[PDB]
Amino acid sequence: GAMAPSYRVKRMDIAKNDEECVVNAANPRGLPGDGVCKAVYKKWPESFKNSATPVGTAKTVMCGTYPVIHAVGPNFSNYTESEGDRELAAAYREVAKEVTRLGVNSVAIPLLSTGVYSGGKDRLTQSLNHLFTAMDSTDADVVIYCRDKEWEKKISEAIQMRT
Ligand SMILES: [Cl-]
Ligand SMILES: [Cl-]
Ligand SMILES: [Cl-]
């Protein structure tokens, strides 16, 4: 585990992370996709061998010795707000189990269901709070990746409020 487990946020491509493993914001079919998923496919294509997994779950596939944890958040265009909230919380709980099982000291994670699976709604707080609920009991250093300047400021504020 990390000596003093922390949360940090960086505004950059998660494919350039400086952590011991990465969480892909995957689709259930293991396809290259778009956004974070397409960047992950270009950087670690070998990790997409048998990576298909249902909504609400996470499946890890190794690229060399580097773990890629494919986590499938719900697409809010298809789920109700109630059922989607439950599956989004569940995907993050499965990421925490995988990070623990892998024994890594750090993990790079995106905010699941906040891009093309958001159903056109701002889900920063919803997704980040489910990330904290799952990851708080792990001892890995967590580094959250985002691309928008206003999102970086809001995520940073939410991390600092708890310290
Ligand atoms: Cl970048
Ligand atoms: Cl998304
Ligand atoms: Cl973003």
Swiss-Prot record:
Location(s) in or outside the cell: Host cytoplasmic vesicle membrane
Residues the entry annotates as binding ADP-D-ribose: D13, N27, G35, G115, V116, Y117
Subunit-level organization: Interacts with mRNA-capping enzyme nsP1. Interacts (via C-terminus) with host G3BP1; this interaction inhibits the formation of host stress granules on viral mRNAs and the nsp3-G3BP1 complexes bind viral RNAs and probably orchestrate the assembly of viral replication complexes. Interacts (via C-terminus) with host G3BP2; this interaction inhibits the formation of host stress granules on viral mRNAs and the nsp3-G3BP2 complexes bind viral RNAs and probably orchestrate the assembly of viral replication complexes. Interacts (via C-terminus) with host NAP1L1.
Residue span relative to the full protein: 1334 to 1493 of 2474
Membrane disposition: Peripheral membrane protein
Protein name (Swiss-Prot/TrEMBL): Non-structural protein 3
Purpose: Seems to be essential for minus-strand RNAs and subgenomic 26S mRNAs synthesis. Displays mono-ADP-ribosylhydrolase activity. ADP-ribosylation is a post-translational modification that controls various processes of the host cell and the virus probably needs to revert it for optimal viral replication. Binds proteins of G3BP family and sequesters them into the viral RNA replication complexes thereby inhibiting the formation of host stress granules on viral mRNAs.
Macro domain span: 4-163
Domain of life, per lineage: Viruses
Free-text description of this protein's post-translational modifications in UniProt: Phosphorylated by host on serines and threonines.
Domain writeup: In the N-terminus, the macro domain displays a mono-ADP-ribosylhydrolase activity. The central part called, the alphavirus unique domain (AUD) has a zinc-binding function. The C-terminus region, also called hypervariable domain (HVD), is mainly disordered and binds several host proteins. This intrinsically disordered domain contains 2 SH3 domain-binding sites and 2 FGDF motifs necessary and sufficient for the formation of nsP3/G3BP complexes.
Organism: Chikungunya virus (strain S27-African prototype) (CHIKV)
